[PDB]
Design a protein around this ligand. Structure first.
Ligand code: BYN
Ligand code: BYN
Ligand code: ICB
Ligand code: ICB
Ligand code: ICB
Ligand code: ICB
Ligand code: K
Ligand code: K
Ligand code: K
Ligand code: K
Ligand code: MN
Ligand code: MN
Lengths: 500, 500
């Protein structure tokens, strides 16, 4: 099976890429696995595969850390993301995001039901497993539980059956047969939970599948539109119908090659302690005492020699930056274009801890709009910050056509030199805020409202007659024939490879 | 003579450090020298010494580019700055800035007058030179003139004789015997010019010395206090009285080892076209038509085989970042401490194009103040933005004790995660602004007023009971004994030198 359609094949692809370290000696899931993974993520090293995890019994489980993190080289920086999508390992961010957006004006390709698959090689009923007895990692030393769920996909369906959502949301072990996790607005798992709670009749049928097709986990991380079933979006993106098997204990369908499947219910009434957790912005607040949603597990099914993917998230760079930030930015780009805004590209700079999105403006089109900064900022902010795709993003930076938004140095340059603080910005206090950002949920103001800004790094003539500067850089402040002479004579004169 | 006290010895020191490339083949001062230098600065390469400059006659002149730019290695990143100051080449920014501040509570060491020096080896009177006939560089293709003055020191004295100021301010050739240049408030060259203009009797006696003692050019770039004679500040910093010779045609004194000296007057009445110029923020606005101050040159004296230092300024990283930004930050640190503010460190992040300064707060002392963000931000902004040392800086970022302000990644992390836009900031519209920043002088608002902000990246408990988080990073979210185990086994397991 292809790497983008089968997690087990994806692990092999990483090994073949010389992008895997197989650790075959015993590693402790209490902190050691995650510490190694954290170090990998901070240094852009090879993904670790823990084949000998202290506490693994009867096949549950090995761990793969850093599945969507960065490679050290510039040439294949985003190669692990490219391997989720059948793209060349040298694919650019633009190419990755365009692949993730490609299904947005294609007909869905619904999934295919098959009678069995690898995820049914082993099962454990209600009397045979205990989630406290599995090698679930403690990921950060002050976490409030063992976070089994950092890179699996929750599967829930609307009461009417019409929308099946796939998404990543964290969850930790509560007891032998329950999890607690985040289920918060405006996320689709929360929207669907609310539908079941208003109906009031039953807990939500649920499954959580770990080690799913890589292309599926990418969509699971992306804010595709309300009511859109991720399975059919992934089918259209990949050009293939995904093969799904039915759960044993409910009528949901999971990917046939899933490494590990939990089946059970998401309560419409119960809660339990959840967190704290070392989060995407780089922080943990030890002892926070929040409540979260409560999941009951009725059955586990799994592949022989199952592998659990794990995100050891926090400071740069991990899946919470590469996937959450970039995929939100992609969706925001499309949203802006659907609202007739002249945006060509969008990216969430890593330097901003993926709290900013830079929006590259087609300034020819801007000029034809005959508008002003105040008016355009307000329009862009209203579109993005009133929509779910804008949830995680607190600062939008508008930049002209000279800026490569995928290059954080250039975004920072433009922001710092072209946006006058206050005058060139519009604050939004009456929009949903993202409480996970420390200055929101642990800050001076409302945890859930406001704290958003549009920062206009377009210069005045970009609205009127065109760019009126040249950069004071090698590229722009010297003629072509001189530049080429300098480069051609660089080593001859005495000064100092693409792949490396 | 020591490298920090003699430019010619500094050039040798760079050669000995394997930090120099001597180009002995012909190089054009029309753009080619500056293009090579620009490339050096963008890539942190070795400083270029142009020994064969097309148009050099009778000893005027060779060029040294990138005299205060960065080295590629982390270990000696700031080595060229350290070589201005007799510091080890591995000196940290903190060590450099502390050296530059050290003279602030020492008695001055006034300069020593000597009867002659190398700067008198050659002279050209009023009938023997033509500044249009010297190999003055065109530094950027759209510059409005040939910028002879990018790394020399202007010398002017108050009418009463009590204050002799040394400073860098740009100037370009106007005609055979005049320059035009920037002379703008609140700079000391402007303050002293205003004193002569109010007296109304004569043009300002002036000299411009190129290739001065490196320790002198560093002070020339620093906003030491009003009325303080840089020569005596440099004397105290270096522990040595600087040796100065009298000008031939006026009673000013120049460093005895100056490579090239212009003597003449700064007009109290005349102006001429100045700029545009590819400036420290990375821009040129071709055709801007400003007027600037006008200098008359009466005499040139110079060393045999004179060397003109040149800054090919613009996008990162050059002397306008390493020196302007860092030295302003140093002065701001001291200013804050003299105003009883609990600031330990200050740095202007390169990523901000040196328009921000991050201020590290001793939060134990902050807690004892029993204050709030709004009140403390306003106090810090009032101190810094009402003072000359704050002129160039438009955003102050307050950070707690965990942040290394000399590490821009960490400043950006703190800013992006701890400062709620709007609520955690105070705007200052009634302070002097820096018009060179594009969003000021080419922006939507007053070129000379406002556009400043204090951004508080202190978290709420930093004001009250203490930090209430741990970072989700390798350093903070794992115990010591685990971290050390992981590092000790890193290569054994299969994962990947200080000097490189
Ligand atoms: C890639 C990735 C995504 C998420 C998360 C993680 C990773 C690795 C954790 C490591 C588990 C940390 C976690 O905080 N986490 C997370 C989360 N969304 C939440 O509601 N809750 C969460 O706990 N997202 C983001 C969501 O996956 C996206 O916002 C997606 O758009 C949601 O899908 P949908 O609601 O649009 O269908
Ligand atoms: C290191 C350095 C400093 C400066 C400059 C340059 C370099 C390399 C140029 C390349 C020539 C570009 C130029 O724009 N330039 C410059 C300037 N100050 C100005 O008033 N005008 C200028 O044209 N400073 C900054 C000043 O040197 C400091 O602000 C110093 O504090 C002034 O001294 P003082 O007034 O405090 O005595
Ligand atoms: O745990 C975290 O990092 C995290 C929680 C969360 C909720 C919604 C969206 C993104 C998210 N990230
Ligand atoms: O409701 C609140 O006050 C609040 C929710 C929340 C979620 C994550 C982090 C901090 C938070 N604070
Ligand atoms: O030309 C430039 O980059 C520049 C001009 C100026 C004036 C004052 C302070 C710093 C400055 N830099
Ligand atoms: O006076 C003004 O309007 C003005 C001065 C100035 C100096 C440098 C750059 C742009 C500028 N604009
Ligand atoms: K999704
Ligand atoms: K702007
Ligand atoms: K000075
Ligand atoms: K704050
Ligand atoms: Mn969805
Ligand atoms: Mn001064």
């Amino acid at each position: 099976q292809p790497a983008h359609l089968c997690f087990r094949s994806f692990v092999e692809a990483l090994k073949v890429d010389n992008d895997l370290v197989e650790i075959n000696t015993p590693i402790d899931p209490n902190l050691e696995a995650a510490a190694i993974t954290r170090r990998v993520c901070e240094t852009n090293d090879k993904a670790p595969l823990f084949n000998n995890l202290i506490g693994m019994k009867n096949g549950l489980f090995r761990i793969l850390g850093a599945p969507g993190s960065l490679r050290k080289s510039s040439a294949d920086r985003y190669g692990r993301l490219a391997r989720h999508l059948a793209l060349p390992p040298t694919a650019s961010m633009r190419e990755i995001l365009d692949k993730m957006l490609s299904a947005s004006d294609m007909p869905p390709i619904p999934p295919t039901i098959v009678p069995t698959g690898p995820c049914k090689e082993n099962s454990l009923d209600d009397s045979e497993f205990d989630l406290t007895e599995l090698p679930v990692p403690l990921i950060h030393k002050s976490d409030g539980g063992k976070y089994i769920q950092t890179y699996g996909m929750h599967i829930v369906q609307s009461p009417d059956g019409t929308w099946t959502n796939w998404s990543i949301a964290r969850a930790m072990v509560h007891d032998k047969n329950h999890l607690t996790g985040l289920v918060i607005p405006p996320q689709h798992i929360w929207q669907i939970h609310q539908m079941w709670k208003k109906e009031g009749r039953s807990d939500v049928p649920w499954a959580l599948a770990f080690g799913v097709p890589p292309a599926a986990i990418m969509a699971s991380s992306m804010p595709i539109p309300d009511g859109v079933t991720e399975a059919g979006y992934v089918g259209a993106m990949t050009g293939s119908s995904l093969e799904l098997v039915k759960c044993d204990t409910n009528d949901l369908y999971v990917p046939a090659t899933s490494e590990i499947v939990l089946e059970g219910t998401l309560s419409i009434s119960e809660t339990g302690p959840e967190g704290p957790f070392g989060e995407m912005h780089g922080y943990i607040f030890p002892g926070d005492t929040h409540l979260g949603a409560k999941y009951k597990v009725n059955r586990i099914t799994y592949r022989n020699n199952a592998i659990m993917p794990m995100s050891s998230c926090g400071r740069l760079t991990d899946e919470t930056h590469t996937m959450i930030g970039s995929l939100a930015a992609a969706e925001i780009r499309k949203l802006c274009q659907q609202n007739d805004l002249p945006i060509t590209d969008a990216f969430a700079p890593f330097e901003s801890q993926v709290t900013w999105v830079a929006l590259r403006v087609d300034t020819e089109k801007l000029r034809a709009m005959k508008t002003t900064s105040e008016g355009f900022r307000k329009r862009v902010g209203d579109v993005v910050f009133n929509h779910k795709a804008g949830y995680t993003i607190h600062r939008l930076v508008l930049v002209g056509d000279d800026i490569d938004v995928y290059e954080g140095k250039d975004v920072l340059w433009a922001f710092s030199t072209r946006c006058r603080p206050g005058m060139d910005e519009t604050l939004f206090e009456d929009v949903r805020g993202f409480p996970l950002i420390p200055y929101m949920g642990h800050g001076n103001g409302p945890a859930h409202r406001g704290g958003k800004v549009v920062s206009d790094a377009l210069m005045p003539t970009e609205y009127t007659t065109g760019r009126n500067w040249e950069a004071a850089d090698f590229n722009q402040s010297y003629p072509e024939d001189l530049k080429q002479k300098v480069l051609d004579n660089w080593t001859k004169m005495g000064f100092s490879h693409h792949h490396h």
